[PDB]
Design a binder for this molecule. Structure first.
Ligand SMILES: NC(=O)C1=CN([C@@H]2O[C@H](COP(=O)(O)OP(=O)(O)OC[C@H]3O[C@@H](n4cnc5c(N)ncnc54)[C@H](OP(=O)(O)O)[C@@H]3O)[C@@H](O)[C@H]2O)C=CC1
Ligand SMILES: COc1cc(-c2c(C)cccc2C)cc([C@H](C)C#Cc2c(C)nc(N)nc2N)c1
Length: 157
């Protein structure tokens, strides 16, 4: 099973200066709950923006660097290698990996951030004519989660 996992804004910004433009604990809980016990595939820059694997799932970094080695991270050097990973595999960023994979994934788990942020990286455009809305759940606003947001599960038609 091949899924996208992404948070994107009203204009499909996903990032700014190798960071997320927003901080939204609800989305981080969402990510952890979806991906615990499973597999995260991410591009090198996305991984390096964090510096350490997320516990309790397989962390897989795609890079052309043959010297790349981090404790608790598995490395792949080709897109083709993704299709050999067992279980539920989540494409986890960044822009380059989304662009490479969006036509290949079965479904997408998208947090729509209902804001317009300054960004330098983007999710690829897509149309709902290719995707069914399996579910659409509004996130609760509070003092810790102050941007409106929607959890979408889309499945390729
Ligand atoms: N809003 C969100 O849900 C998320 C946002 N982000 C954001 O995205 C941004 C980073 O995105 P982006 O700049 O596109 O970088 P990526 O994280 O996608 O990394 C790009 C790198 O991935 C490696 N790579 C990609 N494709 C291949 C391939 N086919 N073969 C071998 N290696 C490959 C290369 O590594 P190398 O150069 O070492 O060869 C490449 O330079 C940051 O702003 C981050 O915060 C990231 C995830 C989620
Ligand atoms: C192990 O490498 C990473 C770890 C984290 C990370 C998480 C998910 C929770 C707590 C702490 C950390 C460091 C994040 C990322 C990237 C930036 C991403 C992402 C992302 C987010 C935030 N939301 C939705 N919906 N999709 C996403 N792909 C990479």
């Amino acid at each position: 099973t091949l899924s996208i996992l992404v948070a994107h804004d009203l204009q499909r910004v996903i990032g700014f200066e190798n960071q997320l433009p927003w901080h939204l604990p609800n989305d981080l809980k969402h990510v952890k709950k979806l991906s615990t016990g499973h597999t995260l595939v991410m591009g090198r820059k996305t991984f390096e923006s964090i510096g350490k694997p997320l516990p309790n799932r397989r962390n897989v970094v795609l890079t052309s660097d043959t010297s790349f080695n981090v404790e608790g991270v598995d490395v792949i050097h080709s897109i083709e290698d993704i299709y050999q990973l067992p279980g539920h595999v989540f494409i986890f960023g960044g822009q380059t990996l989304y662009e490479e994979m969006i036509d290949k994934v079965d479904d997408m788990y998208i947090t729509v951030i209902e804001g317009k942020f300054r960004g330098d990286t983007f999710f690829p455009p897509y149309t709902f004519e290719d995707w069914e809305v399996a579910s659409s759940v509004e996130g609760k606003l509070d003092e810790k989660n102050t941007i409106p947001h929607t959890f979408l599960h889309l499945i390729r038609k």
